[model samples]
Target: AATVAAIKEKGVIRIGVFGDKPPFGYVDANGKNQGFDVEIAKDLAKDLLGSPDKVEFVLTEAANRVEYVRSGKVDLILANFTQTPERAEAVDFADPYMKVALGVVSPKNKPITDMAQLKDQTLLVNKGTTADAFFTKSHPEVKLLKFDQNTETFDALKDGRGVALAHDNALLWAWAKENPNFEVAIGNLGPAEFIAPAVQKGNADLLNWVNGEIAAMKKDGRLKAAYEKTLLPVYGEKVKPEALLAE
Candidate 1:
């Protein structure tokens, strides 16, 4: 009940976002937070606090996104958070703004084009991600090397700590474009998922507000604009907003 009131009183909104993952949430060379999620977060702050600059960015990793919101470490989590029934038990998710699917990326020289190639091969994954759960439940035979950070997982892949790494296809596409040494061997590995903002469970006020905000953005084409601004450049002409946006 007091969530929105407290934030209004403080005149600031604290938003948690990834500081490592690019094209979604990342810190630039100037050490400033910038990305698609950050773009939406700033807009949310503008509507909530009367000024976008009133918001504060809190660096977060994939594994800690839920914890930050639950513990009041951030007023909202705008990280690249996937919606899952398992996670909804602890956090209230706003309407999803992005769509995703698990993808496997490997060195182009030895790409794991077939899922069968993963049998008994070490695969890198970020702990607490859908890829981790997917591989664990559906393909127990694959050896998983897990890390808590997205960069760590990708680093492991680059260093050949594992034969391949699995994560959201969007991220893989962006990374592979930049690296040139790797490719998204498998573009879609699991069911299509939605990525949304989350607030602590029971924070109905904040949750509803965010839902309305997302809808408003969609209505005004701001969602599409955000996609063009941050994600389009990273994904290039191959990927379109219609493929990544959620209704």
Candidate 2:
């Protein structure tokens, strides 16, 4: 509470965000950090401390984003964090601002259609992601080759090291959109989940404020605008702004 209060008093909020994941969070053409997640962090700083410039974004990878918040290294996490029961025990999640699903993407010429088809194919996955955890838990018979980052997972698939790749559906869709060689698979691969920001457990003031900010973002159309500018451009017209939002 003292740390949270100090952050408020100092007019700065430290946020953990992804640096590698594209469309959701990534560096732009000029090497500036910009994306859907970064937009929320800037807006949150404005609402929380009076200026968008008050934000300090620290790059965090999938394996340690929650750990950074849990250990007090960051005041908030806006890293496309999915709200799950397993994670809720360690950190507090605000009401979700977006919804994203997990799916398998493969070469358009040879798409793997279903879970059963995965038995004969190799799937590229990033460790510590829902795609990795879901397949590992549900299907030992499925062949999965794991990596530590999203770039590696996608590259492996591009290099023909794997038959298909599994990740957040938006990421895969964004990739397929960029490269004509691949496409999102025929069937859904995992459950659709709400994506939310997280704070350290018990930071009541911070948690409450984050939730309130999310509701306001939805009402004001900034959330939709962020999607249109960043995600919609990549995922195409088939992806709905309303579907991305959980509110």
Candidate 3:
């Protein structure tokens, strides 16, 4: 509660959110924050500050999510941050509250089903995303067309500038559903990626508070309810709650 008190003393709990990644975090039609990550941020704020409305949303790009927290621009970041060793060294992560997988999306006419197929193909991706980092490290042969914004990356893919778009499956799935011409290929790659909140390194108090809140939410079924209400619609009847939960 000391963290809550401190945040209250500051008069606002600044939360970093993804301005483009939908279903995880994005701006809705009303220009207000809405999505899985945004709702989770609100709930965490509610549990810590006694009301969800106490938090202020700060729009952040993938490249800036960690910097936003590290530089004190935001108290915490819940921008669909995927846990990676490089990132863990610079920022503290709460226990993962969600699980997602990386997938490649391409036009229905030329869907890619294997990494080898990307030999010389252009892949559109946002800078600083795990998909971008992974591909750069693992498949240096693939040419990547980087974009500063996710919308632009998707637009580039839609405009046929790239052979495909590389990103998390949840996002590509959402996009593929909305635009019938696109499809997710290669299924989920490697291990399931754990999505967690990132805070400034050494903020053990804040990190533990967030982890506890997430644990409590899981125990109370609120976490499941959130997934059912928000993600299930996008994922559909074959959806498995276990697929969304952290291992």
Candidate 4:
């Protein structure tokens, strides 16, 4: 609402993003936060403030996303955030730009491809994520080792602290390529979900602005370009762009 005018007055837009989730949000070796989400954030900054560098990236973890926006820590959140019914009650979500589903990655030798295989097994998940929520509610028999950060959850998987790891399928697709010994055995888990930018609750002006920007990005192919530049290299031929991109 009125926040958009204040943002224009400030001349810089603060965005919340992940510093750990790769290909979507992560800090590169150069100390720059670069990813598909980062690309869109920069573009939004450029459109609003006349330069891509006008945006400040606030590094955030999974559990902090909703609180950060609610507390006005960031003007927008583009941290591979999944839009859900419950989350909608807490914040305003713009039109989604990508589709996602949960995936379980385990050892190459004993990959978890079936839901029954997870019974009574310890599965790694990030706290406050859909994976953690889904397993906790639907599969009570499976034990969840929840970590607050993505790095630690993946590390636990590699260190054998958990039998498998559940996260966004798109992330697992990129991760499994880097560590060939592990694989995304269950490529798609839950129902298809969407990733979108979130603003503070009741901020209709800002929400509408972002929705228009997303539509413009889609029309001009900036979204596709972002996918090609940031994600295509990691995904290679394994994932086609059309499969993930929202029309």
RMSD of 1: 1.2
RMSD, each candidate, Å?
Answer: 1.2, 1.7, 1.7, 1.1
- My TM-score estimates for the predictions, one after another, are 0.97, 0.93, 0.95, 0.97
How would you encode candidate 4's per-residue C-alpha lDDT over 1-247 as one tens digit per residue? Answer: 3377889999889899999999999999999999999999999999888999999899989999999999999999998999999999999999999989998999998888887887767899999998888888888888889999999999998899988999999999888889899999888876789999999999998998899999999999999999999999998887888788877
lDDT of each residue in 159-204, candidate 1, tens digit only: 9999999999999999999899999989998678999999989999
Q: Tens digits of per-residue lDDT for model 2 on 182-213?
A: 98874365568989999998888888878888
Question: In model 1, what lDDT does residue 79 have?
Answer: 89
Candidate 4, 39: how far from true, in Å? 0.1
Off by over 4 Å in 1: none
Candidates 2 and 4, the one with greater TM-score? 4
Which regions in candidate 4 have their CA more than 4 angstroms from the true location? none
Looking at model 1, report the run of 10 residues with the lowest lDDT sum. Answer: 1-10
Instruction: In candidate 4, list every pair of residues with a backbone clash.
Output: none
* Residue pairs with clashing backbones, model 2: none
The full ranking of all candidates by lDDT, starting with the best, is 4, 1, 3, 2
Superposed Cα deviation of residue 115, candidate 4 (Å): 2.9
Winner of 1 and 2 under TM-score: 1
lDDT of each: 0.90, 0.83, 0.86, 0.91
True lDDT of residue 44, candidate 2: 82
